[PDB]
Amino acid sequence: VNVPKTRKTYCKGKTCRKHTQHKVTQYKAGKASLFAQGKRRYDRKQSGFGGQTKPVFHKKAKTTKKVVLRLECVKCKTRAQLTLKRCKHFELGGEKKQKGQA
Amino acid sequence: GRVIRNQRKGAGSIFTSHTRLRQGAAKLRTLDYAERHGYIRGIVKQIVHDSGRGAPLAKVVFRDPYKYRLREEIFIANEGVHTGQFIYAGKKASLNVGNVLPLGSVPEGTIVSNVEEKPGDRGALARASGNYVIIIGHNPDENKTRVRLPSGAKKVISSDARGVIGVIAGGGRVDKPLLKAGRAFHKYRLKRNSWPKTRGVAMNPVDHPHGGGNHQHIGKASTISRGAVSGQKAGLIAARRTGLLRGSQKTQ
Amino acid sequence: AKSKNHTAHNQTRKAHRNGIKKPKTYKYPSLKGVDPKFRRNHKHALHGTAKALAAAKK
RNA sequence: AUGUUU
RNA sequence: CGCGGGGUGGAGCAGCCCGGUAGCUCGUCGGGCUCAUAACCCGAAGGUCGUCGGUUCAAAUCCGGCCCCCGCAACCA
RNA sequence: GCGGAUUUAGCUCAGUUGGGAGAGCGCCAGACUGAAGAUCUGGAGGUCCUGUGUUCGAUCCACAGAAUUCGCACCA
RNA sequence: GAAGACAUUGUCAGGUGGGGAGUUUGGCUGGGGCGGCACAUCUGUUAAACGAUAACGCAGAUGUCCUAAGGGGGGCUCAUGGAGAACAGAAAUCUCCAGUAGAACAAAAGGGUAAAAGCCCCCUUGAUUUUGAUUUUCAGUGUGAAUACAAACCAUGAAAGUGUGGCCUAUCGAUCCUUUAGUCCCUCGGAAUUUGAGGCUAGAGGUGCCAGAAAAGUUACCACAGGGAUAACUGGCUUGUGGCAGUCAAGCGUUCAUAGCGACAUUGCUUUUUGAUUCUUCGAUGUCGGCUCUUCCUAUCAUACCGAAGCAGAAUUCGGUAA
RNA sequence: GUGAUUUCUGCCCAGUGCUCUGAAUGUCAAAGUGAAGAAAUUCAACCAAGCGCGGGUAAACGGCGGGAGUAACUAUGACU
RNA sequence: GCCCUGAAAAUGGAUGGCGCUCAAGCGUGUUACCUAUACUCUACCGUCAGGGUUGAUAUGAUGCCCUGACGAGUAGGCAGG
RNA sequence: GUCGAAUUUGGGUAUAGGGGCGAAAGACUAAUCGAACCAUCUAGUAGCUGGUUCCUGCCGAAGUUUCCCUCAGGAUAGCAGAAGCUCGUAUCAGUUUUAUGAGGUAAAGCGAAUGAUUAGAGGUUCCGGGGUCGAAAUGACCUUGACCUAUUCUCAAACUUUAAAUAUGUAAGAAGUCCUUGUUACUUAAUUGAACGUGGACAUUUGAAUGAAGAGCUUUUAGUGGGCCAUUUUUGGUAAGCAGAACUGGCGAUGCGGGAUGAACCGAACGUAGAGUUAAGGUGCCGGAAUACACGCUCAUCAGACACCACAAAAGGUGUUAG
RNA sequence: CACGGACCAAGGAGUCUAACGUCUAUGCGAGUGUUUGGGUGUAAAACCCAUACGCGUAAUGAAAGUGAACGUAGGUUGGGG
Ligand SMILES: [K+]
Ligand SMILES: [K+]
Ligand SMILES: [K+]
Ligand SMILES: [K+]
Ligand SMILES: [K+]
Ligand SMILES: [K+]
Ligand SMILES: [K+]
Ligand SMILES: [K+]
Ligand SMILES: [K+]
Ligand SMILES: [Mg+2]
Ligand SMILES: [Mg+2]
Ligand SMILES: [Mg+2]
Ligand SMILES: [Mg+2]
Ligand SMILES: [Mg+2]
Ligand SMILES: [Mg+2]
Ligand SMILES: [Mg+2]
Ligand SMILES: [Mg+2]
Ligand SMILES: [Mg+2]
Ligand SMILES: [Mg+2]
Ligand SMILES: [Mg+2]
Ligand SMILES: [Mg+2]
Ligand SMILES: [Mg+2]
Ligand SMILES: [Mg+2]
Ligand SMILES: [Mg+2]
Ligand SMILES: [Mg+2]
Ligand SMILES: [Mg+2]
Ligand SMILES: [Mg+2]
Ligand SMILES: [Mg+2]
Ligand SMILES: [Mg+2]
Ligand SMILES: [Mg+2]
Ligand SMILES: [Mg+2]
Ligand SMILES: [Mg+2]
Ligand SMILES: [Mg+2]
Ligand SMILES: [Mg+2]
Ligand SMILES: [Mg+2]
Ligand SMILES: [Mg+2]
Ligand SMILES: [Mg+2]
Ligand SMILES: [Mg+2]
Ligand SMILES: [Mg+2]
Ligand SMILES: [Mg+2]
Ligand SMILES: [Mg+2]
Ligand SMILES: [Mg+2]
Ligand SMILES: [Mg+2]
Ligand SMILES: [Mg+2]
Ligand SMILES: [Mg+2]
Ligand SMILES: [Mg+2]
Ligand SMILES: [Mg+2]
Ligand SMILES: [Mg+2]
Ligand SMILES: [Mg+2]
Ligand SMILES: [Mg+2]
Ligand SMILES: [Mg+2]
Ligand SMILES: [Mg+2]
Ligand SMILES: [Mg+2]
Ligand SMILES: [Mg+2]
Ligand SMILES: [Mg+2]
Ligand SMILES: [Mg+2]
Ligand SMILES: [Mg+2]
Ligand SMILES: [Mg+2]
Ligand SMILES: [Mg+2]
Ligand SMILES: [Mg+2]
Ligand SMILES: [Zn+2]
Prior knowledge:
This is part of a larger assembly, with chains A, B and C.
Chain A: E1 9-11, E2 18-20, E3 22-26, H1 37-46, E4 68-73, E5 79-83
Antiparallel strand pairs in A: 1-2, 3-4, 4-5
Chain B: H1 5-8, H2 33-37, E1 40-48, E2 57-63, E3 70-76, E4 86-89, E5 100-102, E6 111-113, E7 133-139, E8 144-148, E9 154-158, E10 162-165, H3 181-189, E11 223-224, E12 236-237
Chain C: H1 11-17, H2 36-55
One potassium ion (K) is lined by residues 45, 47-50, 53 of chain A.
Chain A binds eight RNA strands through strand 1, strand 2, helix 1, strand 4 and strand 5.
């Protein structure tokens, strides 16, 4: 799919609360932190003997992920998140379609 | 799933050596003042067969230098040693077959037997029938002797380590075919319970890594890593190479 | 071992043992899905009607 | 350096 | 996911490790030499550097993306 | 009988992105040779495995059938 | 004597480690396995004109694709056929006429659509925000999908209006954990500030066995609980296949359909074939063949007596009563 | 491992093993080092063996092709 | 239409058997007759339901009495013994 | 078989259970070995097999829905019991009628769309054009082909204009109808309307039929979650006492009379008795009941003799009967 | 022609407990529960008892926290009595 940037859409920043321009980027998860309580508990549980103490998923079936657009209001900076339908090729860049051309 | 035969050998229950008929440990004299500074003369009283050993032993009687009595020693007989012969052991003994000399006191090219690895260990190297060590040189500073061992290895030994002039008697022994399971039986009856040997490939998987299969076959490479563990080290342990040896030895 | 997959056999008999029950019509039915604008104004209209009918007892 | 057969 | 490395005429390629400027051999086309081929000689053709974007008086080389390949290492929905 | 596969000038094949059927080994013709083989130059060579179907067309986007094979076909 | 702050030993760390330990190694299924997916789903049909409705029924489809192929508005009309224009012919571009859709609308199929839902053009982001109700599946739970509103902010158009993704029917995902966005709110419990962590609300990372364990084989050395819910024998139903037999009569039989045969068809019988099924037996009906022995059937090889012949004799062939 | 004697043990190190090489070499743990921070901590550099890179080895495990044409009858193909 | 040919299987055997031929067979029609735990009436048992009767000697008001209807049953539930 | 050495054997001694020992069979290790024996953990767990102890009375099932690593199990809903509760001028119903819808099956149709499909006939020579002449053009023909026109034979689960029967939604009143006018922030240009009210009028049939051991309501629990059979509709299969669906009725769970016999068929469902009458089925004898009455048909050297049901076909016969 | 049962006697299988759901009975009732313990006793009984504690009388929110009368504790319809 091809999704454009700059997204004039609704903003909930409590100052705009209205349709404003939003810069569009793709959501990237972000590094899993140590000291998150789940990670701390998992490390404590994995320490010592006993082997693997929690499941490790193997039966992968999805061939795509749901792309998330981070929509950032250009004036108030509040971010919103929009999920798109599953796609295999996602481009944020332009190069719109042309009709009647070669 | 079972402990394999080479693992069971280490417990040493039925795998200990059959030492009843043996004459005693074959050793040089204790390295004492007389051998450190001059020589001591003993006499060969008997050349006798040792059970389980190929080479004959020589019972050599020396006088005790500190107490009026005789000290019998069990040497490995070198070829040409005879009963009634005077054996001389020490720094100042002559270069004659059967004499015990420090490695430093013998010229390059000398053939010695029952060579000490360390001075005073009373004999470690070239003890089997027909085997010998060759002095290939000396390093007087940092006093040492370079020697050629029966296996072809070059070793540097202290120049104070002793050896017996000549070659261990009983040589050529392995040139005669045993010709008979019975003769192999009687050979190992006086050495240890290591014969006969069932092939691991003729066993079941529980008994041996090579066991099992609808045909007798190893199934995986018989060359086993040096870092393998007990129960895995069956076959060609840490083999650098396999197959028929073609070409020359003595790599550089 | 394969087995039966589905049948509606005996289902109508089971349902008619305790009978198909009409759903107990009520006056003043619920206003659940009714247009919230209409409902918002209906609340005010009813409060005003209640106040008027109360005051009308003089 | 290569160059067959009649 | 991390850390590295590589992608250049048809092919292998040097070129990059701080722009002065895309080359080497084979293969392909022509001629010469030979009695004729091979080697050889003289020519001629073949790329603008895997694809984008950026720095820079002027970037294959710098800088970051994307694709492909490889090596090691990592693995709680 | 199931799961795969590949069918294209005489032989081996490249194919084909909704073009247009091509390259070798053959064959023919012409060169070179006293001549033959070798070698060079060319030229033809298929109604694209078959019928019907989507189609502007489409062996090639596409449907089923065939041919040649492989692999499997077990516990009794 | 050798050796030396190195070995060694202790702790932690990385590698190696079926030598050994523990465990696992789907389900449906005309037995199981192999195959397939009928496991989560969508179209048409089966389906018997409300709804619902099965099979490893039938013909197919889904894990995508699209910043337009979403939204609004305007203008136009499609497939095809005929008639015409230099190159230009069957296919190029131009023109008229007919044209109920015989086109197109991403994909499967079905429905729907003509001043449109199709084609072209213009502007856009309603594919947005909040949290409820509702319909299908349904337990009237969840998930997915969809419907109609409300409260905002927008888009488009002159406007009425229309728009909360794709004309409709499929195109997808819990807890825990991680992560992001938001609220800048709540908590860190002796009292504060700042980091850090933990909460609240909404998403994302995924379970396709699709209400969602983390999982390789082999056993002809085998074990246990069971199963006739289920295979390998007989028996029973069936008779496709096998075997046997009719009816018709185009032909063969030099002539001549039927002495003897007999195509194209068609009606049966049998259960000495093999299938199909899984009803009996898995707390056990001894599982090939032969040997031995008895009896039964007749669809008769011989023997008895006969009818027919392409029966001269002889031999043979067809057939009847006959076991 | 093979299995008296006799005769002989062909080719293959691509794969899986085993083995030899080693600061020129990518990756690579704890400790240690540097930076930033108020610190927890984060980041970076360095980082042993192993693996990778290079070699050897089959009396290690093992493995060891297909199609077409072609000879004064056919047939078969020495041959390509 | 009926009958016959078509019409062959294995222990000896089956319109149920015997046997039946203007049938005791086939088609059809009319009556009479036989008999189920069914129907009708009555009695008795129980269950359920609706009632009467604390006005006394009257002790069974969970009692006494009146009326009608009903009664199959695995798994299972409950009740009275 | 072997019998003078890898010989046989006594005693002593060593090796102990994931251990030993094995000239190797998973052999042997005290009748125990693909992991000994003893005791304990331990009454190990079992969705699996077996059993589960008195009587009578009343009521009385399910093998279906959804979900599950589920398919021999459970949860869930349903079916069942029990306890009742609120009322009973009363409520409703596996039914009809009237009124009003909805459907796309049966049938039907194809000189109606789509798709199949048989044939001849008119045109189109621009028919596809060939042949043949035509010096040649299609120019004449001949002709095959196609198209077009009007006809013709036959068809469709996934075709259709039409379109049943059965089944199915709703309504048939007092929570109704009519008249007046109060509230509102909704709605309208507007007391316009919408919704909810106030006040007023209308009880014999309060607005079809029939019935109503009453109606409504609640809680809580059992068992069940293998089903099978019959008619009819119907799918796969040659078919099956096969496999799978729909509606109903049954069997399971059920005796009784009948079908000799038999889970399901016919009849009829059951407290203990008596009398009468019957059902289905029967009435020669077995055997209760007419060797009844009446009209015909049939003679079988395999007669026939009551549905389910325990079989027979095509084709034939101056047998006989009637047309 | 599925399994157990040759026979007989005796034994022989839904128990108790912790915590609970519904229903019912009883006591008291915005309260209720004496029995941890104390007093007492004819001594494991019966009798008596303080302070607490449990549940209830308040909910809601993750939490900080806040916390139930417009009114005759409301209007309408039905409602036994
Ligand atoms: K652990
Ligand atoms: K051996
Ligand atoms: K093996
Ligand atoms: K291991
Ligand atoms: K296993
Ligand atoms: K048959
Ligand atoms: K069995
Ligand atoms: K190799
Ligand atoms: K190798
Ligand atoms: Mg650890
Ligand atoms: Mg050996
Ligand atoms: Mg063996
Ligand atoms: Mg092993
Ligand atoms: Mg191994
Ligand atoms: Mg074997
Ligand atoms: Mg079932
Ligand atoms: Mg010549
Ligand atoms: Mg293991
Ligand atoms: Mg299975
Ligand atoms: Mg329907
Ligand atoms: Mg329009
Ligand atoms: Mg769905
Ligand atoms: Mg709107
Ligand atoms: Mg829509
Ligand atoms: Mg998710
Ligand atoms: Mg969290
Ligand atoms: Mg604290
Ligand atoms: Mg599921
Ligand atoms: Mg069975
Ligand atoms: Mg047949
Ligand atoms: Mg069955
Ligand atoms: Mg038996
Ligand atoms: Mg028997
Ligand atoms: Mg016969
Ligand atoms: Mg041999
Ligand atoms: Mg580190
Ligand atoms: Mg290293
Ligand atoms: Mg007959
Ligand atoms: Mg009779
Ligand atoms: Mg009669
Ligand atoms: Mg009676
Ligand atoms: Mg009463
Ligand atoms: Mg009863
Ligand atoms: Mg074995
Ligand atoms: Mg027990
Ligand atoms: Mg009953
Ligand atoms: Mg699951
Ligand atoms: Mg069972
Ligand atoms: Mg239909
Ligand atoms: Mg029809
Ligand atoms: Mg069950
Ligand atoms: Mg049952
Ligand atoms: Mg019955
Ligand atoms: Mg019968
Ligand atoms: Mg009688
Ligand atoms: Mg007939
Ligand atoms: Mg039987
Ligand atoms: Mg049993
Ligand atoms: Mg028994
Ligand atoms: Mg008893
Ligand atoms: Zn903003």
